[PDB]
């Protein structure tokens, strides 16, 4: 009764939290977005072909699952097109998406998008039985609960959760810095937090800010709790008539210019400094030109500290930094993200190795049958002439030599083009090649460090392909 | 399986579980008593502009539209409430004007989802008009973007008089219905007389009403339930003995009390025949029921038919023990109200409604007033400002000189600067002056309404009388002691 009500409470709370709160540690990818990328990979249409303008994709998404609104699925599409909010990059698109401005793109299917470049190598190896699957409620198609990865996007894109019990802030980071962190933890299981300070000088943004504190960053990467400073960029230049002109490019994150400017107008117009009727905040299609000019007989820095007291040019940005794994939430630190991603990639690589051994040893068994057929042929021909049935021919071949049923029938699959001797040598050559590759994979399976070397290989692949610098200029 | 070790998150998720199951299904709200899905239906029908003025529309499309504008919640209760607020007989008042297949009142809920073609009723025009009306906070949904209102404000305690169905969630409650006219009467008496007694409004208020038309006996339960909302009362069907041309008698019913099937009770009658626990009964017949409900039991002579009617309202389900439970919720926390306190919260809600509407209109008039202030100040010293624009260069110089000469703001100065020759006739100058003073008179009128609170009460009573004129409410039930 009340225990069953508690069971309903527990199970339904798990349903809501695993539905729309923080995703798994293993991916950092929410299942809405997971199914977006899975169905867009299963569109099959390459990003090389010009990216499409349709709600047919989202119609197949809603055929895959019924939410409490596919407008929310389109919101997920658009929020993954928010490069100014969520970093590089998940949408190859063309249509209206705006900026961090207060933009409303009601043109839903009229936007264009398809697969993105990072998604291509990000979600390979589906054909290698790497990830498990579950059936939908529609009992017709399957879906994976997690994904294979080529980086911890956990660190690449942060989290802005909701307070089902409590929300979660997770800051973004840099590509190559994360690669160096992976290499560091790979080479040493004995790293420190100063090591993390080295390979990660600090969390960054697609826009940029200033984070002056140090021990808040320290408690952030250790305890998982703490708040930081997000500060706008400040440039003090000289007006030709003597005004301390303020140029602003960076901002605190999730801070529109519009309502901040309106409250600045209000604070001017509530019996305060009114001679600052100089707000040249435009031309922001080349960058950000947020320029004011402080009036005469007034210093810029006092108005700067007053707008920092307005909590919009300098903001205490907190961090909750929680996660979901094994059905439980967790307070975060590193060597957890790190070791989790490491052992996940270990799973992926080793299971890929097992599947490749499956294909290779199956084809090796085939070429065994091929070479044993191509040893002695004409006696088999003449005994086939003493038969009239492929079942009789199968029994004859079982009397002749040791084969499989598949092997016997594949040897039956031989026209007269198969009756040469050069192709015997070719099958023998690829047979020895395949045996060498099988022995290579077996020796790799008897090698722990070789897995890490393959991880280094894929890291160097994506590092030659792409890199990124710290656009977020942070002084401490 | 579970393996969840932290009891704290179990408790927090359990509190969210309990309160969310509360919030989800039907609740005794402050302002509508409704399900939130009802609010969703109404707000979607309003902001799509689907009037009963315009013709009918396929409504499952509208259902999917609202479902996609809102959360991916399940279709079942959605289509259920879609039917329920279109059922004319169940809810006392008309909301949704369907067109298809429903089943009348006899246990056949026709659910033709393909045939879902409908409109609404004309009472939402009295219910809510918050387009410009700064009333209610909004919550955002699809990556947290699109509005959804918290409550359903109104000028009307109609949904007090409708009735509620919120039972199986935690504890049980409902709202039994009344009619509207004497409700308007007793409400207006509390309005003009803030210190009245209960029973003198029971002199104004008849029994709790029913759409079929019920025979009510007794008033002690009325005394208990108008105060404390608890107790069952007795209800009987309009049932008569009628003589033939032969002298044979007939039990003729007209209707039944609330939540009664014809057919299940008819099967129970056939039971009572084969149960052999009631005699005399010969004919159990029912015809021509669509011009008017006519079910007839017919009994042989020498049977004491009125004693058989007594046996009906003892043992059969024709007798109704209709119970009340009105256990309120005011801002989340569960409460319980008297009939006064309901209308009190209604009064102070109307206070905030008309005050905030008046302040929105005030800011309309103030902004347009600053506009026309700038226009008339531009009309004051025209040729000086002509010399100003012939002299100066920039926006800053123009705003500096206009603020130095006339002490106006920047938007006012630019709206001055946006004046073309075709608005320079003295005709339109004095039309600007005329409409300016018109808006001044409207500002003074709204400040006078801000001076005294009882004008709100008077206008409310006026439009209550307008609604009672367009919506005359005769009675259908019957009260006895």
Instruction: Using CA coordinates, name the residue in chain B closest to A329.
Output: B9
Instruction: Using CA coordinates, name the residue in chain A closest to B2.
Output: A327
For residue A86, count other CB atoms closer than 10 A to its CB. 19
DSSP character for B149? B
Please tell me the distance from the alpha carbon of residue B104 to that of residue B211, in angstroms, as a whole number: 14
Please tell me the distance from the alpha carbon of residue B222 to that of residue B206, in angstroms, as a whole number: 9
Could you give the angle at the alpha carbon of B153 between the alpha carbons of B152 and B157, nearest 5°? 100
Cα four-point dihedral sign A291, A293, A299, A303: negative
Closest partner residue to A71 (CB to CB) among B73, B142, B399 is B142
Contact predicate A431/A371, CB 8 Å: yes
Contact predicate B326/B174, CB 8 Å: yes
Q: Where are the beta strands (DSSP E) in B89-245?
A: 96-98, 117-120, 215-217, 231-236, 239-243
Resolution of the coordinates, Å:
6.3
For residue B140, count other CB atoms closer than 10 A to its CB. 11
- Is any Cβ of chain B less than 8 angstroms from the Cβ of A98? no
CA distances from A364 to A357, A408, A421, A429 (A): 10, 15, 20, 12
Contacts of B4 in chain A (CB under 8 A): 10, 327-328
For residue A393, count other CB atoms closer than 10 A to its CB. 19
Strand pairing partners for A142? A135
Q: Which residues contact B420 (CB under 8 A, 6 or more apart)?
A: none
Overall residue count recorded for chain B in this entry: 481
Q: Please, which experimental method was used?
A: cryo-EM
Please tell me the distance from the alpha carbon of residue A356 to that of residue B457, in angstroms, as a whole number: 83
For residue B55, count other CB atoms closer than 10 A to its CB. 8
Closest partner residue to B142 (CB to CB) among A9, A17, A72 is A72
Q: Where are the beta strands (DSSP E) in A154-233?
A: 159-160, 169-170, 226-231
For residue A141, count other CB atoms closer than 10 A to its CB. 13
Contact predicate A173/A204, CB 8 Å: yes
B197 phi and psi angles, rounded to 5 deg: -105, 170
Residue B115 designated active-site:
yes
Please tell me the distance from the alpha carbon of residue B401 to that of residue B385, in angstroms, as a whole number: 9
A334 phi and psi angles, rounded to 5 deg: -85, 180
Contacts of B145 in chain A (CB under 8 A): 75, 104
Please tell me the distance from the alpha carbon of residue B271 to that of residue B289, in angstroms, as a whole number: 23
Overall residue count recorded for chain A in this entry: 476
Contact predicate B51/B45, CB 8 Å: no
Contacts of B5 in chain A (CB under 8 A): 328
Chain breaks in chain B (C to N over 2.5 A) after: none
């Amino acid at each position: 009764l009340t225990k069953e009500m508690k069971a309903s409470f527990i199970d339904y709370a798990m349903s809501v939290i695993v539905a729309r709160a923080l995703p798994d540690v293993r991916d950092g990818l929410k299942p809405v977005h997971r199914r977006i990328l899975y169905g867009m990979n299963e569109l099959g249409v390459t990003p090389d072909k010009p990216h499409k303008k349709s709600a047919r994709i989202t119609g197949d998404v809603m055929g895959k699952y019924h939410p409490h609104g596919d407008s929310s699925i389109y919101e997920a599409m658009v929020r993954m097109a928010q490069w100014w909010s969520y970093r590089y990059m998940l949408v190859d698109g063309h249509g209206n998406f705006g900026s961090m401005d207060g933009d409303s793109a009601a043109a839903q299917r009229y936007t264009e998008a398809r697969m993105s470049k990072i998604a291509l190598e990000m979600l390979r190896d589906i054909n290698k039985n790497t990830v498990d699957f579950v059936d939908n409620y529609d009992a017709n198609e399957r879906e994976p609960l997690v994904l294979p990865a080529r980086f911890p996007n956990l660190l690449v894109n942060g989290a802005t959760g909701i307070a089902v019990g409590m929300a979660t802030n997770i800051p973004p980071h840099n590509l190559g810095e994360t690669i160096d962190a992976v290499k560091l933890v790979m080479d040493n299981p004995e790293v420190t937090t100063k090591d993390l300070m080295e390979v990660l000088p600090g969390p960054d943004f697609p826009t940029g800010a200033l984070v002056m504190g140090k021990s808040g960053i320290h408690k952030a990467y250790e305890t998982g709790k703490g708040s930081i400073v997000l500060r706008s960029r400040t440039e003090i230049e000289t007006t030709k008539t003597g005004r301390e002109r303020i140029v602003v490019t960076e901002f605190p994150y999730m801070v529109n210019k519009t309502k901040v400017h309106e409250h600045i107008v209000r604070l001017v117009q509530e019996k305060r400094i009114e001679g600052i009727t100089a707000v040249r905040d435009e031309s922001n299609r080349e960058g950000v030109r947020f320029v004011i000019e402080v009036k005469r007989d007034a210093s810029a820095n006092v108005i700067l500290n007053n707008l920092f007291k307005m909590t919009q040019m300098q903001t205490n940005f907190g961090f909750n930094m929680l996660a979901i794994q094994n059905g439980i939430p967790k307070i975060l630190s590193l060597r957890q993200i790190l070791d989790a991603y490491i052992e996940h990639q270990k799973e992926v690589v080793v299971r890929r190795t097992r599947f490749d051994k499956e294909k290779a040893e199956a084809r090796a068994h085939i070429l065994e049958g091929l070479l044993i057929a191509l040893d002695h042929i004409d006696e088999v021909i003449r005994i086939i002439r003493a038969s009239e049935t492929d079942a009789e021919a199968q029994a004859e071949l079982m009397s002749k030599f040791k084969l499989s049923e598949r092997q016997s029938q594949a040897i039956l699959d031989m026209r007269l083009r198969r009756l040469t001797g050069l192709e015997r040598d070719k099958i023998q050559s690829e047979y020895d090649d395949l045996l060498a590759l099988i022995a290579d994979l077996a020796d790799i399976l008897a090698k722990p460090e070789r897995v890490s070397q393959i991880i280094k290989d894929e890291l160097d692949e994506v590092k030659r392909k792409f890199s990124d610098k710290r656009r977020t200029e942070l002084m401490v």
